Structure formats: structure tokens, C-alpha cells
């Protein structure tokens, strides 16, 4: 009864995220005047969010509406690994976008000598390698012995894998994003003083607020409930803070191409 209702609003979110993240890629794959490192830092974020909304998220919706895992155990292992990998790569794409914008507004003339076509490629390599190191954590060593029932798909919640990956996958990128965007905000107030602090404060506030509002509930419920045995939350709040991190990948195409005038001229041209 309510399974079709929850499934159709979930599939609406899936189609919205897939269409948005394929529009961000199509804005660059056809418009050849977008060829810089700043545009590739949005392209790889759209690639990570498209892999999540295309390959991971239909199986998350099926797992939510059915109640059990209707595929094999190797498909469950692949799905959990690709889930952690694509979400971690999305968060680190946000982090490297933030670093690029900081050393773009702090060194405007010395930007093509400090962000070259080789160091941005190496930054993509080093964020995707660390996402892949975190996601293939429990695949050989970081796993307590799971039950052998094929119709369950349990995520890994080891204390020590949750804490380390939570730290190095949210709390260091959160601190970096906050530092670089507060310095960007300080520069954007000319380092009419009312119409300048309001616009930059609103623009950076929605950018950092969507990120924290989608990912801080998950990364606050997950390490705290894995360490303090007194705090055990409900099972509705876990699904809510689980799906908010999925919602971030559908929120991201509305924000980051609309924070670029060339992308704003290409996005409405490709749709």
C-alpha cells in the first residue's frame, strides 16, 4: 500500500539526481569552451553523484521498499563497497572544489602556476584512491563475521572502522571546507557594504549548509551510536540520516553549476 507510495517518491528522487548529474556532464561534453580545472572539479563531482544515483541508489530504493535484499551476497558486497566509495568521493570532490575556490580568490594572477593541468589530475587521483582505500576496508580485514543469510545486506559498523573513516572522510573535509570558505567570505567582502556581505553570506551559507544538513546527521549518529551503548537511536531516524546523504547527491547539481556563470549559460542551453 505505502510501498508503492514511498517507492515512487524514492524513484522520483533517483530520476531527478540522475537527470541533474547527466546534465552537468552534458554541459561540458558538448560545450568545448569549458576546459579548465575548475570545470573538471565539478565534472568529477557530477561523475561521483551520477555513479551513486545510477548504480547504487535503485538498489537502495528496492532494499527500502521490499525489506530484504533480493539479490546475492556478492551483489550486496559490491553494492556496499560502491556506496561507500561514491559517497566518500563526492565529499572529497566538495573538499577539492573548496580548496580550488580558495586559491582562486586568494591568488588570482598566480592561479595558472599554482593549479596546473597536472596537479588537479593528481588531486583527483588522490581523492579517488583514498575513497577506494576506505571502501575496500571491510573487504579483506576490517569486517567482523557477518551472518551468512543471503537476504540481508548489513553495512560494516566496526568501532575503529567507523571512527577512523568518519574522521578522515567527513571531519577533516568539514574543517577544510569551513576554513577555506570562511577565508573566501572574508575576501568577498572587499578585503554598498550591505549588498556585498549579504550576497556572499547567503551564497556560501547555502553551500556549506546543504553539505552539513545532509551529512552531519549521518556522521554524528554513526560514530556516537557505535561507541556509547546508552545512546541507541530509533530505526526511523537511522533511515532518515541514511537517506539525507543520498539526498546530497541530488542537491549538488542545483548548487554548484548555478555557482558559475558559464555553467549557468550552459545548463539552461542543454536542457
Amino acid at each position, epitope marked *: 500500500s505505502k510501498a508503492i507510495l514511498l517507492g515512487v517518491i524514492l524513484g522520483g528522487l533517483i530520476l531527478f539526481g540522475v537527470l541533474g548529474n547527466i546534465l552537468v556532464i552534458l554541459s561540458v561534453a558538448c560545450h568545448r569552451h569549458l576546459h579548465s580545472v575548475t570545470h573538471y572539479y565539478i565534472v568529477n563531482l557530477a561523475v561521483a553523484d551520477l555513479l551513486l544515483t545510477s548504480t547504487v541508489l535503485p538498489f537502495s530504493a528496492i532494499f527500502e521498499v521490499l525489506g530484504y535484499w533480493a539479490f546475492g551476497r556478492v551483489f550486496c558486497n559490491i553494492w556496499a563497497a560502491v556506496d561507500v566509495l561514491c559517497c566518500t568521493a563526492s565529499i572529497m570532490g566538495l573538499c577539492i572544489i573548496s580548496i580550488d575556490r580558495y586559491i582562486g580568490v586568494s591568488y588570482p594572477l598566480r592561479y595558472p602556476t599554482i593549479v596546473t593541468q597536472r596537479r588537479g589530475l593528481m588531486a583527483l587521483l588522490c581523492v579517488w584512491a583514498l575513497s577506494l582505500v576506505i571502501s575496500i576496508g571491510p573487504l579483506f580485514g576490517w569486517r567482523q563475521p557477518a551472518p*551468512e543469510d*543471503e537476504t540481508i545486506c*548489513q553495512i560494516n559498523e566496526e568501532p575503529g572502522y567507523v571512527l577512523f573513516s568518519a574522521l578522515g572522510s567527513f571531519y577533516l573535509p568539514l574543517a577544510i571546507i569551513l576554513v577555506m570558505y570562511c577565508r573566501v567570505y572574508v575576501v568577498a567582502k572587499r578585503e554598498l557594504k550591505f549588498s556585498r556581505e549579504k550576497k556572499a553570506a547567503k551564497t556560501l551559507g547555502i553551500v556549506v549548509g546543504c553539505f552539513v544538513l545532509c551529512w552531519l546527521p549521518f556522521f554524528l549518529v554513526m560514530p556516537i551510536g557505535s561507541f556509547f551503548p546508552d545512546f541507541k537511536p530509533s530505526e526511523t531516524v537511522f533511515k532518515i540520516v541514511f537517506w539525507l546523504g543520498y539526498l546530497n547527491s541530488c542537491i549538488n547539481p542545483i548548487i554548484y553549476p548555478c555557482s558559475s556563470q558559464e555553467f549557468k549559460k550552459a545548463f539552461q542551453n542543454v536542457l
Partner: nanobody
Amino acid sequence: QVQLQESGGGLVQAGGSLRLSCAASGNISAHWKMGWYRQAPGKEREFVAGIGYANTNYADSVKGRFTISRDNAKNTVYLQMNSLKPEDTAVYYCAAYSYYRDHSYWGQGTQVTVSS
């Protein structure tokens, strides 16, 4: 905390019948599965049966002749094993695992022997 304590096992002739039980001494949520697994001396743990709210699952070697049942009021799970072949001689554990979170309580174990 939940301490699954299973019983009911013993010594069965070939083709006989047994009825395993697993109690809880606590509370398992209704959105959790509860199953029976089996480990032979020499091999590893294999899944045998499981009942939750979303499905009832069996292993394909015990699919026709085993029957899992659950009483959520007394928080107990029964496994009626009929027509016992001489390869079910193993240790049977009961588990109270979850579907999507790394939560698994495990029983002590009960030896079930089939001979001929």
C-alpha cells in the same frame, strides 16, 4: 542485552524428527530477523533457516523438510526438522541478526546427531 539460549537437540535416528527451540531472555525488535545456522566439525557456518517480517528464507538442501516458526510474544524461534538425513550431524546455533545494520546476537550452540 539479549542472550539467546537454544535447546531441544539430541540424538535422532535416520529419517526421524527433532524440534529445536531458541529463547531470548530479552527483547528482539520485530524489524529484526531470527534464524538457525549450522556448522559441521570441519566445515564452516552455513545458513539453514530464517524468519523475519520481510521474508522467510531457507537453504536449498533443507528446503522441503525443515520448517522455521516464530513466536514474537515469547520471543522464541522453533525449527522443526523432519526426515533427518545423515549429513545434518552438526552444531546448530540461533541468531537474532538485523537486515541492514551490523547487529548480530549469537546463541551458544546445540549438537544434533543423525546416525544409522
